Design an enzyme around this catalytic site. Structure first.
Site, mmCIF file in Angstrom:
data_model
loop_
_atom_site.group_PDB
_atom_site.id
_atom_site.type_symbol
_atom_site.label_atom_id
_atom_site.label_comp_id
_atom_site.label_asym_id
_atom_site.label_seq_id
_atom_site.Cartn_x
_atom_site.Cartn_y
_atom_site.Cartn_z
ATOM 1 N N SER A 270 0.955 -1.154 0.060
ATOM 2 C CA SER A 270 -0.084 0.000 0.025
ATOM 3 C C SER A 270 0.931 1.286 0.160
ATOM 4 O O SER A 270 1.742 1.396 -1.105
ATOM 5 C CB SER A 270 -0.945 -0.125 1.201
ATOM 6 O OG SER A 270 -1.915 0.953 1.158
ATOM 7 N N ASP B 186 -8.023 -2.831 -7.571
ATOM 8 C CA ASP B 186 -7.879 -2.584 -6.176
ATOM 9 C C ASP B 186 -8.622 -2.025 -5.325
ATOM 10 O O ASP B 186 -9.301 -0.966 -5.897
ATOM 11 C CB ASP B 186 -6.319 -1.844 -6.102
ATOM 12 C CG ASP B 186 -5.843 -1.566 -4.950
ATOM 13 O OD1 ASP B 186 -4.874 -2.117 -4.360
ATOM 14 O OD2 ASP B 186 -6.194 -0.618 -4.162
ATOM 15 N N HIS C 4 -6.763 -5.914 -1.452
ATOM 16 C CA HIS C 4 -6.000 -4.985 -1.274
ATOM 17 C C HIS C 4 -4.873 -5.678 -0.424
ATOM 18 O O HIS C 4 -5.379 -6.301 0.559
ATOM 19 C CB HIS C 4 -6.616 -3.688 -0.777
ATOM 20 C CG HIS C 4 -5.702 -2.490 -0.338
ATOM 21 N ND1 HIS C 4 -5.073 -2.011 -1.502
ATOM 22 C CD2 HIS C 4 -5.254 -1.941 0.697
ATOM 23 C CE1 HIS C 4 -4.424 -1.011 -1.122
ATOM 24 N NE2 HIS C 4 -4.615 -1.023 0.141
HETATM 25 O O1 NUM Z 1 -3.742 8.929 -2.752
HETATM 26 C C1 NUM Z 1 -3.787 8.756 -3.839
HETATM 27 N N1 NUM Z 1 -3.110 9.488 -4.860
HETATM 28 C C2 NUM Z 1 -2.483 10.646 -4.519
HETATM 29 C C3 NUM Z 1 -0.877 10.247 -4.715
HETATM 30 C C4 NUM Z 1 -0.474 8.909 -4.190
HETATM 31 C C5 NUM Z 1 -0.460 8.967 -2.764
HETATM 32 C C6 NUM Z 1 -0.047 7.523 -2.032
HETATM 33 C C7 NUM Z 1 0.191 6.693 -2.601
HETATM 34 O O2 NUM Z 1 0.633 5.593 -1.953
HETATM 35 C C8 NUM Z 1 0.388 6.639 -4.084
HETATM 36 C C9 NUM Z 1 -0.103 7.855 -4.764
HETATM 37 C C10 NUM Z 1 -4.618 7.474 -4.430
HETATM 38 C C11 NUM Z 1 -4.784 7.517 -5.892
HETATM 39 C C12 NUM Z 1 -5.591 6.476 -6.532
HETATM 40 C C13 NUM Z 1 -5.870 5.489 -5.636
HETATM 41 C C14 NUM Z 1 -5.730 5.504 -4.244
HETATM 42 N N2 NUM Z 1 -4.978 6.418 -3.969
#
Ligand code: NUM
Length: 342
Positions: free
Chosen positions: A145, A242, A287
């Site tokens: 994650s 996911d 997940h």
């Molecule tokens: O937070 C999200 N995206 C912001 C960047 C990010 C932050 C943390 C990370 O582990 C990877 C990318 C996100 C976008 C799609 C699905 C789930 N989460």
């Protein structure tokens, strides 16, 4: 059991200033080392981090950590639970920086919290060198994650750290589980990471930073944009559907509009993995996987994840007879793979 060690450099801290640390179980007959990065989302401003400190404090502080942890899945020492690396030296690095392992900022008169994830990884590596890591043949940096994204952001920095310290024979590799996301349109997040990077003084890999340039470093948190810039070998594990991706997309499980949305999401994820030669991507709604005890159960095209990782090891000694490393499901709906978890 893996035993807790708080960092000897007490200036490398969790969010609240308590020392960061790691859990360790040595295997002196082995020259393989597995360093696993825990996940658990992130926080991106003072009010949001204050709420996390109230009800997710172990993700922000070492003050209540237990003395031991049980190794599970890829961290298990039992061959039946871990056919891949059961004899390795095992390290679990708790996530207490709330910064997707990217931060390099101390608590100060102007900062209520410390965000030191990138520095925690480097200090753990340094302190392990005196406990046997100096003799390693392979260091596998793994994570799930937010920790899977942390692998992508930090694996090349670990490789450079070890080269600069004088350990050229240690082969550094990455294993990123459930950290490969799409910056797609919702059915009904990028602003949070843009704010967070500034709040954390977050750092991303140098080649990716140079491509996207000032103000646009947030791009490097998305696997399909940062992965082509990396030099170290990286194996990518990602469910095609996911649950964290579907949550931020506002999908809750079907009429035609949602059917097409879900099918397009799987197609796009499969496309981003086409040029990733070491990967495992089943057509399931789930997940995380690699520290779950039943991680041995899922298969793609008849090959399990522990087998695929073993075949990857062999490939790094051109394709191998009966030992594949690129395993991506083609069927287009969750649980069209019969081996998906229930
Ligand atoms: O937070 C999200 N995206 C912001 C960047 C990010 C932050 C943390 C990370 O582990 C990877 C990318 C996100 C976008 C799609 C699905 C789930 N989460």
């Amino acid at each position: 059991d893996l035993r807790l060690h708080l960092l000897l450099n007490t200036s490398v801290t969790c969010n609240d200033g308590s020392p960061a640390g790691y859990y360790l179980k040595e295997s002196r007959g082995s020259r393989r080392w597995l360093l696993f990065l825990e996940g658990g989302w992130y926080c991106f401003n003072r009010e949001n981090c204050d709420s996390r400190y109230d009800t997710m404090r172990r993700l922000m502080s070492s003050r209540d950590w237990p003395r031991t942890r049980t190794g599970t899945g890829i961290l298990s020492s039992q061959p039946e639970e871990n056919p891949y690396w059961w004899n390795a030296n095992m390290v679990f690095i708790p996530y207490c920086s709330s910064d997707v392992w990217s931060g390099a900022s101390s608590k100060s008169e102007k900062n209520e919290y410390a965000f030191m994830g990138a520095l925690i990884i480097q200090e753990v590596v340094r302190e392990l060198l005196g406990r046997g890591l100096s003799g390693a043949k392979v260091l596998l940096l793994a994570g799930s994650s937010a920790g899977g994204t942390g692998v992508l952001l930090n694996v090349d920095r670990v490789a450079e750290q070890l080269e600069k310290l004088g350990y050229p024979a240690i082969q550094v590799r990455g294993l990123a589980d459930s950290g490969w996301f799409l910056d797609n349109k919702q059915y009904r997040p990028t602003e949070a990471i843009r704010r967070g990077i500034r709040y954390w003084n977050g750092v991303v890999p140098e080649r990716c930073r140079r491509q996207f340039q000032e103000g646009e470093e947030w791009n490097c948190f998305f696997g399909y944009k940062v992965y082509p810039t990396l030099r170290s070998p990286v194996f990518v594990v990602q469910w095609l559907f996911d649950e964290a991706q579907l949550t931020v997309d506002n999908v809750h499980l079907v009429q035609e509009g949602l059917r097409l949305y879900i099918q397009n999401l799987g197609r796009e994820l499969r496309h981003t993995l086409k040029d990733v030669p070491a990967s495992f991507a089943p057509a399931c709604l789930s997940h995380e996987i690699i520290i779950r005890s039943h991680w041995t159960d899922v298969q793609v095209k008849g090959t399990s994840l522990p087998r695929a990782l073993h075949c990857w090891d062999r490939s790094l000694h051109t394709p191998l007879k009966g030992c594949p490393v690129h395993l991506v499901d083609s069927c287009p709906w969750p649980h069209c793979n019969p081996s998906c978890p229930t």
